[PDB]
């Protein structure tokens, strides 16, 4: 499995896309938020269920090999890199990164 | 009007002889329009990939028979079992040529399995025949491999039922153990000196070492072991004066495969004279039905009698009238001292030298 | 833990009703070996699943063979739930970790002998075909009879050689003179042998026939040559659905894993992939009980307390479930054995005498049954009495006792010569007979009203 | 649950990963490479309870992972590459196979 | 056993069978060792409570 996401850099004052190259009705994609100099933090699992203890402003959807991520409203928190990870086949692989400003 | 045959062979000379025999099968059978198509595969180190590949290929070729003819397996398991189970799912008869494990005589598990070599229970039968020679009625039994130990014990019981005699002691345990001196001391106190051995070579070497430490190789001791017990490092620790048996032509694969292929050709021509000759489908995909002539073909092969030695499958689908030889450990060089006929024992002129005293 | 529940069914079983536990639910139709291997290797890459629960709708027994083989080659426990995959095989292997449900031949044989004892049919024979596994049955029967309280009468064992030529096989079939006959054969040979026996005339009402679950094949497939009243026992309990079976399998697996975790934490291990072991549940789930139901296994893989069911063939050509199996005992819904005189439309069976007697000191001695063996002593005879419980209600119980005396000696000798049959019992109405305003009572009330036939008891 | 690791390095090296928040004999341990300029990679996993080990084909023959059941430490040896390293553990609910607990990070350079 | 659990002492035995055994030993060529039976019952076949087997 090889992943590819665009744009490499995003200019906002937003949305993200991650296209792949499902497991019996279950989607296997996770999004990680990594501030500079800090370990990654899981944000979304199963491509539709958010993680407890996180702001409700985040929501995601997608199926098959085309999945997307959007955020609203915009705040100071979403200022890091992001990626998408697959788990349908071992070993796992991550995205290419996406800044924000 | 074509017959497909699948085989598993690695040696190229043996495969060439196999193709030669398949070609020569159409010689004495006239100019009939039946054809024999050959299919062969080689070894792979794994046992699932080999299984699936052989199953799919011989299903797609729509073959009738399958053979296994490789003694020198680096794996000590000697497992043609996936081939047998997969070709029995469609009740397509399978032919074994090397494996001699007594488990394969059970036809409740292996539905469509036959082989032309006898399992080791026949050696127990030959031992019971030897008991008819020297008038012995007390024995001590020790079998390690519990997969076939129960079968060997049951065969010995069936043999003894005619005389209605019972063994003085029997023993089974887990192969690979070494502290077996306690059971040796237990057997020492008894009256019989008849010791029956059927185990792995590790266990055989272990018990030979333990008995040599305990000095049970003196005069009066009766020793009798099977073929598996005197090979490898087990032969190294073998006390002098022991008696061994031999499987005649059990390794010259050439004539073995030749006879098997001749039998297959005659059986196929015999079946061609009958009606309702269906064929196996490409059961690899979406063909969940059994061969409606599966049991029919199996029973046709069961009644296969021949005279050109005689090959004859019993109700267990095993070859009878096998010739066995008798070997003796004379200063650790094997010497032929007897033979076993179909139901008789014929000693030769070589002296019967025992670990203790007299040759009597 | 990670458990996969795969069902190969034609019956519409949907999927939505199906520290780290995950369950997999699937529905499958095809049953070809390549599909099995492909599905197993695909799911084996699906998050390290250790549990496999399988059932089948077809009646092919090679599926269980392949499942056991793959379990051995993957070191993953597998269960059998329904169909040919749940059929009890011959001899499992310690290398394998495959386990089933349902009883073996020996347990069913013990149940059959219990059923025979509970009706006091102490004369029988033994008929065996060339079907594999007959010698184990023979040995088990020989060992079971010699250590029993009954002292059974066994005729010489009938063994078939081939498809009966009716030349020398009929010679052995003629010598069968008992009333109870035991048959061990496949379904295809049963039709032939039963037609042969019906031509020989051994298909009378007293010539009962008992067969194991092997010969009873499909419930829908019913040959016409089976007389209405064949004795069969099979583990097919229709009151318990497959949902309960898989739920009990899940309970077994969860209990075994939970109990094996404490002795050693890193027990659940499945192989990485098809291409390319110290502590397990192999020798650990011998003892297990969930929600009171003892679901323990044996050393060879069998069950400890299975669910066997006694079935017979009614006049409507259907396998009629009659008796179940308790924890160890045997229950019977129909205590009094029905005659089933009509096996076919060519069987006018008619012979039996309802005999009612009264307790007379030297002629009719009523004694309780011997509790040591639960059988009337051989010089007594069976009987029953409808014993009322209380005086407020008329409900009563048919307590079975033993009768002897002097007049009972007469009745026994009469059946020796005239060769008839009787069902002895006792009068609960009262004394011999008294016409109370042109109304009789007792024995006279049982022969005039023709509720009975004769009365061997002393009468004036 | 918290994780700790060794210090920086500067041939062959060894990096420790110690567990002090759970039963160390139950959960797998995975190693990650995060060389700057790209997202990440995946090396292998190890189960301390039984010692079963699997390795990635790309890193096969170069990274050896070992564990000690007594001190609850994880050892990964690279023989004969300058990148930041992480040792991590899954939540345990399985299936998802995500990474939740992260180490500190050991910076190796040649 | 209820009275004397395990108290075995060498004692003196005589009578008829003792003399018969002495005569047998004198006539033939062997040795012997006289010992008693743990109970005083001749011997009966009885089911043991386990395995439902007569012993
Ligand atoms: C009669 O014998 C011939 C020769 O053994 C059989 O032909 C063989 O058929 C198999 C199955 O189609 C072929 O295997 C295939 O080979 C191709 C590459 O050539 C591969 O891409 C497929 O995946 C598969 O492995 C085999 O090559 C072919 N051999 C020859 C020399 O023809 C024939 O099938 C037999 N009779 C029938 C009709 O089954
Ligand atoms: C092994 O088997 C082969 C084949 O049966 C034997 O070779 C035969 O030997 C005889 C005698 O020399 C010849 O007449 C045949 O023509 C040979 N046939 C073939 C196909 O080679 C060989 O002698 C046997 N060797 C052993 C070990 O017994
Ligand atoms: C046969 C055996 O060992 N019996 C035990 C029983 O004593 C115990 O209560 C139960 C639950 O642990 O498991 C079983
Ligand atoms: C067998 O072949 C014959 C002749 O073709 C045919 O009549 C018969 O129906 C076939 N088998 C059966 C019983 O279907």
mmCIF file of C-alpha atoms in Angstrom, chain E residues 6-46:
data_model
loop_
_atom_site.group_PDB
_atom_site.id
_atom_site.type_symbol
_atom_site.label_atom_id
_atom_site.label_comp_id
_atom_site.label_asym_id
_atom_site.label_seq_id
_atom_site.Cartn_x
_atom_site.Cartn_y
_atom_site.Cartn_z
ATOM 1 C CA UNK E 6 -0.666 -51.714 60.443
ATOM 2 C CA UNK E 7 0.909 -53.991 63.076
ATOM 3 C CA UNK E 8 2.596 -57.045 61.549
ATOM 4 C CA UNK E 9 4.870 -59.213 63.692
ATOM 5 C CA UNK E 10 6.530 -62.574 62.896
ATOM 6 C CA UNK E 11 4.538 -65.280 64.664
ATOM 7 C CA UNK E 12 4.354 -69.078 64.916
ATOM 8 C CA UNK E 13 1.962 -71.027 62.687
ATOM 9 C CA UNK E 14 1.121 -74.733 62.809
ATOM 10 C CA UNK E 15 -1.711 -77.179 62.184
ATOM 11 C CA UNK E 16 -2.565 -79.282 59.127
ATOM 12 C CA UNK E 17 -1.722 -77.220 56.033
ATOM 13 C CA UNK E 18 1.603 -76.191 57.586
ATOM 14 C CA UNK E 19 2.601 -79.854 57.831
ATOM 15 C CA UNK E 20 1.358 -80.471 54.289
ATOM 16 C CA UNK E 21 3.469 -77.592 52.959
ATOM 17 C CA UNK E 22 6.508 -78.828 54.885
ATOM 18 C CA UNK E 23 6.065 -82.261 53.319
ATOM 19 C CA UNK E 24 5.737 -80.687 49.864
ATOM 20 C CA UNK E 25 8.918 -78.660 50.331
ATOM 21 C CA UNK E 26 10.809 -81.703 51.626
ATOM 22 C CA UNK E 27 9.713 -83.871 48.694
ATOM 23 C CA UNK E 28 10.710 -81.358 46.004
ATOM 24 C CA UNK E 29 13.528 -78.875 45.415
ATOM 25 C CA UNK E 30 12.658 -75.279 46.241
ATOM 26 C CA UNK E 31 12.333 -72.736 49.033
ATOM 27 C CA UNK E 32 9.426 -70.714 50.378
ATOM 28 C CA UNK E 33 8.314 -67.841 52.608
ATOM 29 C CA UNK E 34 5.077 -68.024 54.606
ATOM 30 C CA UNK E 35 3.043 -64.835 54.990
ATOM 31 C CA UNK E 36 -0.531 -63.955 55.917
ATOM 32 C CA UNK E 37 -3.365 -62.267 54.030
ATOM 33 C CA UNK E 38 -4.172 -58.645 54.827
ATOM 34 C CA UNK E 39 -7.790 -59.550 55.634
ATOM 35 C CA UNK E 40 -9.632 -62.677 56.752
ATOM 36 C CA UNK E 41 -11.912 -63.095 53.738
ATOM 37 C CA UNK E 42 -11.396 -65.805 51.132
ATOM 38 C CA UNK E 43 -12.087 -63.473 48.209
ATOM 39 C CA UNK E 44 -15.064 -62.186 46.224
ATOM 40 C CA UNK E 45 -15.563 -60.362 42.928
ATOM 41 C CA UNK E 46 -16.872 -56.905 43.816
#
